[PDB]
A paper describes a structure:
The TUTactivity of Cid1 has been shown to be important in promoting mRNA degradation of polyadenylated and 3′ trimmed transcripts mediated by Lsm1–7 and the exonuclease Dis3l2 (12,13). Cid1 has been extensively characterized both structurally and biochemically, revealing that a single histidine (H336) in the nucleotide recognition motif (NRM) is predominantly responsible for discriminating uracil over other bases via a mechanism that was proposed to involve two alternative conformations of the H336 side chain. We used an RNA-binding-defective mutant of Cid1 (K133A/R137A/R277A/K282A) to improve the resolution of our crystal diffraction for higher resolution studies.
Deployment of the trap door correlated with H336 side chain flipping but its absence from the Apo crystal form and other UTP-bound forms suggested that its stabilization depends on direct contact with the CTD. In addition to the novel structure (crystal form I, space group P1) described in detail above we were able to crystallize the RNA-binding mutant of Cid1 in yet another crystal form (crystal form II, space group P21), which is also an Apo state but this time with an observable β-trapdoor. However in this case the β-trapdoor does not bridge the two domains but instead is stabilized by contacting a crystallographically-related molecule. Normal mode analysis of the model, complete with its β-trap door, demonstrates that this feature is comparatively more flexible than the majority of the CTD. We suggest that this enables the trap door to act as a ‘strut’ preventing the collapse of the catalytic cleft when enzyme substrates are bound but before uridylylation has occurred.
Numbering used by the authors: 41 to 110, 114 to 206, 207A, 208 to 381
Write the structure that this text describes.
């Protein structure tokens, strides 16, 4: 597995975010914080997502949150203040939920490349990010592995939730589930199920986990990055059974069925126009903190087929005995599904 490992680190250096790009995004966060401070002093602007957890690809987008205690006008007023500051953007309202999307920066020196998403009181997203940051700190192998999977999923056109496949966060959870509960010895302990974990309730959910990393013993797993990646691909390709099983972080053995979960069901809720929005559980990934949410709800039968197929193709490629193996095929673009 040594040469594949070499390949992975080489690609990882290519696709990871530069310090320079990281610096510019950081500066942008500061400028945006000033704008919020002028109109609301007590309000806070918080970064989350890939950039905050160090799990970001090149040219990633910022995910930010404006949070406040106890109001309805601040979303629009912020957007207006941002436009006035020379930013270019959109103000979006759907299902009574407001979002701000910045697409360019004309005055402060970030250029037209600048892109940003701002949301309001998304506390759960912040805590999800905190967990991911902890694991990223825990083992050096996690960051390259996650980045490569993200790159792989994007290229194989299985990273489009709106078109039937899986979100980036879902794949990270798949990786994390594999490292904690599948591979032996475990790369990771389960921080949620730790003895030292203390209950913390935010928005009616337990978001608490053991975040005292220095007291956590070193990993008993000494596999190379290439070895972890191959095993991860092979597991979902063959071992994992999506029809009966749930990806979860709430079980010591990581064993949960949809039947016990109650996610065998196809399920419906009504949108703002009272259309039927069906929640599929064809792929079941139970969000670590938001238990009700299925991160995999977006996957469809055609979608799961494509995802599983790429997993098989990846495994077969790495398992292949016809040297020299074409590792670059792993990241070559796939014909886009019509």
């Amino acid at each position: 597995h040594k040469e594949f490992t070499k390949f992975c680190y080489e690609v990882y250096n290519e696709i990871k975010i530069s310090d320079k790009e990281f610096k510019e995004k950081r500066a942008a966060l500061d400028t945006l914080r000033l704008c919020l401070k002028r109109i609301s002093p007590d309000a806070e602007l918080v970064a989350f997502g890939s950039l905050e957890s160090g799990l970001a690809l090149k040219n990633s987008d910022m995910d930010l949150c404006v949070l406040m205690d106890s109001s309805d006008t601040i979303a629009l007023q912020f957007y207006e203040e941002l436009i006035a500051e020379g930013f270019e953007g959109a103000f979006l309202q759907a299902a009574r939920i407001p979002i701000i999307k910045l697409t360019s920066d004309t005055k402060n020196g970030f250029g037209a490349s600048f892109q940003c998403d701002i949301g309001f009181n998304n506390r759960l997203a912040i805590h999800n990010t905190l967990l991911l940051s902890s694991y990223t700190k825990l083992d050096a192998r996690l960051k390259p592995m996650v980045l490569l999977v993200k790159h792989w999923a994007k290229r194989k056109q299985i990273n489009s939730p709106y078109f039937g496949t899986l979100s980036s966060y879902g794949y990270v959870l798949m990786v994390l589930y594999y490292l904690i509960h599948v591979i032996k010895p475990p790369v990771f302990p389960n921080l949620l199920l730790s003895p030292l974990k203390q209950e913390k309730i935010v928005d009616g959910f337990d978001v608490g986990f053991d975040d005292k990393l220095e007291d956590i013993p070193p990993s008993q797993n000494y596999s190379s990055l290439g070895s972890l990646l191959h095993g991860f691909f092979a597991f979902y390709a063959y071992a994992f059974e999506p029809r009966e099983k749930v990806v979860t972080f709430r079980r010591p053995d990581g064993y949960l069925t949809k039947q016990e979960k109650g996610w065998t069901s196809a399920t419906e809720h009504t949108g703002s126009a009272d259309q039927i929005i069906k929640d599929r559980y064809i792929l079941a990934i139970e969000d670590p903190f938001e238990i009700s949410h299925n991160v995999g709800r977006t996957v469809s039968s055609s979608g799961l087929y494509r995802i599983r197929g790429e997993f098989m193709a990846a495994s077969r490629l790495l398992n292949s005995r016809s040297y020299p193996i074409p590792y670059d095929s792993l990241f070559e673009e796939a014909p886009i599904p019509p």
